């Protein structure tokens, strides 16, 4: 039978779901979590062979190692070894949706291994194999017997081969499908891939043994005293002689201890549970777990004989923490808690949707370090050592079962249908089944994106009655329906309604309020980071901080989904959808991360460190308040740096250490400062540094800063009278200024600066002209397609109203000659198709000292879309090595984007002042800036700018980052303004409209100088 | 005010005269304005102003310029917003239109004498031969802010020879959320630090 076209068959074979086991057989092993010997791991070098189908496969390969095949690797996806492409697509499914069929034309992976068994796991006991990941579907067979069955890619799938095994020499056989009818269920937004791509084990368990066990901790109204019960089940030969020991430990010292017989409490007509026990363990004054202190005991589960022998253990890291929702609020251990989260698919750039111990460890790092206190597992559950580590490092996290239904039409097709509540139930319930014990794991998640269907009712209630301890959520069908404890909407905007028919998506302040509404709002994803992204994040931390209720949300993404692949050179660059042949494929949108593939940050990750920084400042004179928004430490590490500089000059600057409790606040009076008379504004920046270092951060780290203006003394000083008259030469087509060593050339016929030079150095090698417009981002281009234009998102408007190809058109051009200057002055019109755009009037004032002061004014038609920018561009003809500028930084910021930068004098390698997204375009913009320094030039007055080797042309016509070119010289994008980036969402139009250059008239004014 | 700068310059067709001032107080520069003035032979004046704002003076209650004009005319003739008072933060109700009152509807009788009579949005604005062009805000009456100030009842106002204009490149919000307290909300205020705004005073 075609099992793998039968969502009624979603197994065959299986062993029951169950929390981590490794049957120790000595209790000190377990107590320490070392490794046991009787947990193998069969990960290595195996045999691999491709089908297109498994029709395909040859029968011979039950019994024998296909001389064709070759030895790869496991565990990993087949697409990353290059048999066949992965592919990239986000809402359609890869394949035509025809449930429950799949194509006929499926690939068919062929795995196998010749491995060892030693006799002794033969002469007693259970010996089973594990499959931690095998995506989609597979048979098995073990010395080419049939075993068994699979289907879930995301939950360990276990058999029995007690039966199977020989001494010596064994060889399994997995034919692993690509598609089966739980791809149904696995459309999330991700590259489509397959292979047995997790761990792969032996575990060899006692006849008698401990099959499942739960962990619970309750506590009285303080949290002063707690009771640990855990709840215990066996299989095999129950005898009055058996026992449970479940003991306690903190450390080396043991704190609680409990032993009984089995035989639960009656529970019903027929009796209890003969083969269930219950240990209550009394802990007083228990070290509570939070994602700030990631306190943990350990809990040994030992089944012995009375007499003494142990037959085996058991044991999980315990944290001793309460979840609940009362009163609207998610309270953590009796707080209510802040999420800074981040969703977190699991990605490498060159092995695909394998994770390894390395990099989750690196991520995790990072995310602390970036002030995030939580995880959700988008959108399934995690490769296991995933929850160890959140447990350990301390990371709040949301458990997801692996049902995501995207592409369904409608969206919850599937989910309302009771034939495919089989398929769900055992995505969910597989999934409690194994995580349960986790401290780490705070909320369940019934999957993403499937609607809302009575399947999710059903399930809801599941989880609700078998572990009441944590709540459960999901955002399908609206973000508030009757299968979620929590409003967990995605992309919902602070302050602006979005009325969709159906599954609105309110303002997240107005969404608390609807009549009888009274849940708690977390966004289970928002402040959609793709590109040049994250504008506006600071207007969520400043709700989430002013109403109870906003208690945060969860970014997306962390990393970006991009796969490395390799030019004719042998040079690897970073692949997005469409990139291995695959199509249809959403492009770009793989792409959504805080981080590039290989860990590197983008620049918006500096910005949602700041805004989820942990202390909160207030200047009142010279007193700073710091309010800590920790809910259980101290700041046992933490001391306050502060100094204060002059327009970039340092003038002062001392440390303090912070004391300040959970909730709690410290004053901090400043000393008597400089009072300069000298001109110039005075800026006050503080920063929390932890002098120790700890599991997650090295001594030093910076952990918070804020910035504040404090005296400002402008200039009123008079320059210098200048020994010397700029003289001015005159033809039909030039105006020529001579000046010293210097000299200006305008055209005449196009109105504008065609070249300087210094000495009798060029400096231009394109004229200095007003530039409208940009090289779009993702979030302007939005869906927008060639095959399918999205009329409203930014670029398509701006493209429609002619703004990337309006021409100049030159009103006037004048050339005056004052006492000490010569005066230029010059007026265009850009136009397009009859449609005046904008109006550009300038002067351009040239002294006796060899500055040029230029003065502009723009008037935009109050109909045409609202340009990118207003400003001026250039093609400078030096390179120079670095780039100096006071004003915000050091990092790429903009608009919306900003908060995190501090006004400075920074000072960086010309590369630093370019960011590479992957799709090119807009990028590297500091706004805030007072005074540009690069090579010979100066450039003062209050703009932002870019500068680069890739023109705004360029990037707009390259589509990846590798593929760009320096170009001679360098190019300058000076503006006076600059629209917002926007990316609440990346698919409609996302800018504020605070950050829209809606004003109709615009000024900005800079001075050009040398040195 | 104190000078910095003050100098003439004769361009092809037009004189271009150029000022720069300070503001001070107890030796701090609060405000910087500089200015240019353009006179060219249609006789019409453009006035460009770049005032600069100290940050961490108190956000002011305008940028603008004012003058006491000689004449008193029976009708004031704009194109912005009204007919009535309006403010930043209280000009929804206001329309875009062409307005003509009598001189005294442009002054409001609040009991206790404040500014008043501003009307904003305002691109052209004409007073017996005067026209002013631009994009300001503006009031006109015959009382100065002076006398305004120092009078604590409407019934004692005297209007004053000729009559005051006020014309504003920026105003602040008049605030109310409770007269008690600070009220002006943050996007009401003057809190740019540079701001720039220019007018064409013509015949009429
Ligand atoms: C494009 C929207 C209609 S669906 C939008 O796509 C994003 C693509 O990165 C993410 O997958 C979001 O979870 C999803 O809601
Ligand atoms: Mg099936
Ligand atoms: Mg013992
Ligand atoms: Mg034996
Ligand atoms: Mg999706
Ligand atoms: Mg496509
Ligand atoms: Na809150
Ligand atoms: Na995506
Ligand atoms: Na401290
Ligand atoms: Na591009
Ligand atoms: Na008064």
Redesign the interface.
Known sequence: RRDWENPGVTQLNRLAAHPPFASWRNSEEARTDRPSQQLRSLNGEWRFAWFPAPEAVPESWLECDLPEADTVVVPSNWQMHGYDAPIYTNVTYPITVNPPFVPTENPTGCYSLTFNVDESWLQEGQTRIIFDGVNSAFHLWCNGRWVGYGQDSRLPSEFDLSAFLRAGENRLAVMVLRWSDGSYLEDQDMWRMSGIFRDVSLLHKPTTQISDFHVATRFNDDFSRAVLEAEVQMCGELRDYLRVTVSLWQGETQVASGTAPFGGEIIDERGGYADRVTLRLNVENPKLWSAEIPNLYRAVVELHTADGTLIEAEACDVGFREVRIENGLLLLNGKPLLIRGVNRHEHHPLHGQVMDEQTMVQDILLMKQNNFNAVRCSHYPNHPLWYTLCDRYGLYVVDEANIETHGMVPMNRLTDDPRWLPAMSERVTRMVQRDRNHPSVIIWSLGNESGHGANHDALYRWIKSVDPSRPVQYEGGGADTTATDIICPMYARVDEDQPFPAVPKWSIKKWLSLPGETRPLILCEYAHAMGNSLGGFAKYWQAFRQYPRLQGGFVWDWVDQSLIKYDENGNPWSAYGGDFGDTPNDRQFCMNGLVFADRTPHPALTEAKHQQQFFQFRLSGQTIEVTSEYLFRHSDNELLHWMVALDGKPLASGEVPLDVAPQGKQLIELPELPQPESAG?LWLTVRVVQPNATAWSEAGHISAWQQW??????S?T?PAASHAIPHLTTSEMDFCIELGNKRWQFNRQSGFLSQMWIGDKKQLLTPLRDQFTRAPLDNDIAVSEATRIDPNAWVERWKAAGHYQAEAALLQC?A?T??DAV?ITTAHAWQHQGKTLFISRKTYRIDGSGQMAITV?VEVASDTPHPARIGLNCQLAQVAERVNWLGLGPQENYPDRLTAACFDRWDLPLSDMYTPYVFPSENGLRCGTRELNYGPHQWRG?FQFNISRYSQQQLMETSHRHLLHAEEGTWLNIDGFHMGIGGDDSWSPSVSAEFQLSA??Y?Y?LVWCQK
Request: charged share 30%; glycine share 4%; proline share 0%.
């Open positions: 504004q203006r404090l005296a400002e003394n402008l009123v008079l004048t005056d004052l006492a005066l004014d209050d109709g008239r000024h004014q």
